[PDB]
Amino acid sequence: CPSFQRVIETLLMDTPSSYEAAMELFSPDQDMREAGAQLKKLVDTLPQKPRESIIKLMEKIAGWRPYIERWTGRLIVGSPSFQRVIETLLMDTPSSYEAAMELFSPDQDMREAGAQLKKLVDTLPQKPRESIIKLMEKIAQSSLCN
Amino acid sequence: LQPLPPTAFTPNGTYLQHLARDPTSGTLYLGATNFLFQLSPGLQLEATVSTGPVLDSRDCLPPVMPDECPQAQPTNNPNQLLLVSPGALVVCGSVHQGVCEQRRLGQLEQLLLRPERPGDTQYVAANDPAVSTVGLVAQGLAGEPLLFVGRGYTSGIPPITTRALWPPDPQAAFSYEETAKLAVGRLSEYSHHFVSAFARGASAYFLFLRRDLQAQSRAFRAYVSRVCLRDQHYYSYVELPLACEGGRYGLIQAAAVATSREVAHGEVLFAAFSSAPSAAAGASGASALCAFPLDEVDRLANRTRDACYTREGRAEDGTEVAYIEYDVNSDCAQLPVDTLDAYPCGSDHTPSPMASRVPLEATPILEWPGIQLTAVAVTMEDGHTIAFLGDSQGQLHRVYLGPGSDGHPYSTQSIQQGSAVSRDLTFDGTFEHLYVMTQSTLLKVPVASCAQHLDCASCLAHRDPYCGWCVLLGRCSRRSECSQWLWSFQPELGCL
Numbered sequence: 122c123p124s125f126q127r128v129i130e131t132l133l134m135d136t137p138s139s140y141e142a143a144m145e146l147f148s149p150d151q152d153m154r155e156a157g158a159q160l161k162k163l164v165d166t167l168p169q170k171p172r173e174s175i176i177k178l179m180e181k182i183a184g185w186r187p188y189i190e191r192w193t194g195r196l197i198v199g200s201p202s203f204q205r206v207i208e209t210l211l212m213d214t215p216s217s218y219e220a221a222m223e224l225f226s227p228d229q230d231m232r233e234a235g236a237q238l239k240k241l242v243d244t245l246p247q248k249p250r251e252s253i254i255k256l257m258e259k260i261a262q263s264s265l266c267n
Numbered sequence: 268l269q270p271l272p273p274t275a276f277t278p279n280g281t282y283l284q285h286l287a288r289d290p291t292s293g294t295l296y297l298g299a300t301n302f303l304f305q306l307s308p309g310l311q312l313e314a315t316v317s318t319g320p321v322l323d324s325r326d327c328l329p330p331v332m333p334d335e336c337p338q339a340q341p342t343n344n345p346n347q348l349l350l351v352s353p354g355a356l357v358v359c360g361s362v363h364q365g366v367c368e369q370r371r372l373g374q375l376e377q378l379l380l381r382p383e384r385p386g387d388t389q390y391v392a393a394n395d396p397a398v399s400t401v402g403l404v405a406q407g408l409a410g411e412p413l414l415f416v417g418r419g420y421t422s423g424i425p426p427i428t429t430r431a432l433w434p435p436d437p438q439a440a441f442s443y444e445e446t447a448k449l450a451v452g453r454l455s456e457y458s459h460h461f462v463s464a465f466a467r468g469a470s471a472y473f474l475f476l477r478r479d480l481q482a483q484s485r486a487f488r489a490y491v492s493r494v495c496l497r498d499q500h501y502y503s504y505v506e507l508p509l510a511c512e513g514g515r516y517g518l519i520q521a522a523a524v525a526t527s528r529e530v531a532h533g534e535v536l537f538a539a540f541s542s543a544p545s546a547a548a549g550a551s552g553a554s555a556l557c558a559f560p561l562d563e564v565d566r567l568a569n570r571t572r573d574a575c576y577t578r579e580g581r582a583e584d585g586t587e588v589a590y591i592e593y594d595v596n597s598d599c600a601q602l603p604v605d606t607l608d609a610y611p612c613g614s615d616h617t618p619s620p621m622a623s624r625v626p627l628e629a630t631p632i633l634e635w636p637g638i639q640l641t642a643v644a645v646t647m648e649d650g651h652t653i654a655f656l657g658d659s660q661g662q663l664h665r666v667y668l669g670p671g672s673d674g675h676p677y678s679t680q681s682i683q684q685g686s687a688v689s690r691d692l693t694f695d696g697t698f699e700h701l702y703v704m705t706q707s708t709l710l711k712v713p714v715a716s717c718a719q720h721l722d723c724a725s726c727l728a729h730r731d732p733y734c735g736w737c738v739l740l741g742r743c744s745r746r747s748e749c750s751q752w753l754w755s756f757q758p759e760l761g762c763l
């Protein structure tokens with residue numbers, strides 16, 4: 122989904138304007154905008170090579186189809202693997218985020234890079250992380266990717 | 268591959284319109300032309316009631332009297348509304364301007380409540396069998412049962428009304444009060460067509476088509492609307508457009524939440540849509556199943572209410588997302604943030620009736636061309652969500668909605684070829700059967716039939732998420748019957 126990946130290109134190595142504009146096209150909420158801004162400031166503090174290695178991880182991950190999760194009755198639009206990366210990064214332990222990365226066979230560089238992101242994301246408060254989740258769910262049902 | 272249903276009920280000389288199940292007893296109630304039937308869970312008759320035909324004319328008001336209405340002739344009475352309530356069956360025909368009545372659960376032949384001289388606030392259902400009527404039973408702030416009614420336009424009765432089932436004066440039954448209505452100016456032009464009504468939490472929800480007179484297209488469009496389940500005005504009423512693959516499948520047809528032993532009413536609405544008010548018939552048509560979490564419906568409606576009350580219909584970025592619908596003299600306001608908590612369901616000074624410019628969007632879980640879905644039920648087996656979908660050609664499709672699926676049905680069965688499946692599809696108590704209804708018959712269909720494969724190999728070849736090979740028993744069964752079980756859908760092992 123090109124228009125989602127330049128949301129990712131601009132998050133990790135481009136200006137907050139280009140990031141905010143890559144996000145805006147998905148018609149985000151306002152909860153999603155402040156939380157998207159808080160994340161961008163943390164992604165800014167990362168040195169370049171971490172981000173460059175993150176982009177390769179992020180885009181190596183990059184299939185979407187809606188299903189209903191077993192036992193829970195939950196609607197997921199994405200893949201179980203992608204959902205796992207999403208929730209462990211934003212709502213679970215560093216160790217569980219780590220194991221979700223190992224699904225996509227990263228090298229040592231993407232590992233240590235993603236571990237810094239997770240360390241960083243964990244400084245956000247609870248509700249912004251939750252908004253970033255509702256934001257990625259928004260992206261998948263967007264009639265952009267389909 | 269599915270056997271013939273084991274149990275059928277087919278009324279001689281009449282057509283079927285609606286099915287209602289009493290969950291306390293499991294008793295089924297059937298509304299047919301000139302008939303009401305009471306059925307055991309094995310589809311054997313307990314009671315039959317004649318509701319017609321009656322001396323009638325749409326130009327006359329009931330009581331219809333020969334010397335007073337000379338052009339009245341015998342008129343067949345197809346059933347327009349059939350609902351179980353805490354102490355009664357609610358029954359509305361299409362004759363006599365859609366007046367209703369209440370009958371004793373378990374003793375259908377016993378009339379409990381029927382106004383003798385109904386007035387014009389008691390004409391409930393569409394008095395045209397072509398036009399659709401939907402309803403919802405719920406309790407008011409004092410525990411008194413209420414009837415929500417969604418009534419399409421007939422060739423001037425509010426499209427949505429909240430009517431009292433047990434008013435203290437029995438003659439007032441089924442009437443709505445002055446404000447317990449959605450006041451719509453141009454009924455004929457909006458041309459509501461109602462598909463379903465359902466309650467969840469503190470709200471009542473309606474699914475319908477109507478012309479989008481506000482936009483340039485004035486095209487028929489799918490909506491969900493929400494009203495506070497006890498706000499007996501329509502202060503809280505808010506409409507949301509519904510998009511399935513962005514409106515490619517424009518016409519909502521049927522919808523259900525998951526129902527099973529594990530949950531009686533799930534949180535995810537599964538709606539069937541068709542491309543285009545009727546769907547394109549035959550190969551040209553196509554259908555989709557779109558899932559909407561009800562929590563997403565509620566967030567969009569909340570945001571719409573919040574924008575209209577406190578930001579003159581604007582979202583946080585200043586964009587125009589909410590407005591007043593149906594040409595009602597009312598505008599989005601800039602009320603104090605305080606009023607959101609003071610008036611969660613609004614008041615007489617809050618904007619009304621509200622609507623979203625922003626649609627609720629969903630991606631199809633299945634796109635099926637050449638199929639016109641008309642019926643949706645959803646259940647759960649061993650944690651798997653399975654959809655049962657009926658179509659216009661009298662076919663019942665079973666579909667796995669879990670991860671890894673690609674939307675193809677794992678079984679299709681012919682029920683009554685060419686006859687639409689009724690959207691009043693519903694399960695029995697144990698979720699072992701589906702009650703499938705067409706205009707001709709009521710069939711009791713087993714959700715699966717694993718026992719028909721006596722050998723491991725055939726058990727596993729005929730993939731069906733209900734079924735698997737029970738090694739110690741040497742049967743093809745549901746997991747729950749296997750006191751080591753090879754799931755036919757994804758088998759841990761083989762037969763050798």
Ligand SMILES: *[C@@H]1O[C@H](CO)[C@@H](O)[C@H](O)[C@H]1NC(C)=O
Pocket residue numbers: 562563565566569607611
């Ligand atoms: C919607 O608003 C109501 C009342 O303001 C609140 O009770 C409910 O939790 C809200 N639901 C969502 C999904 O925001």
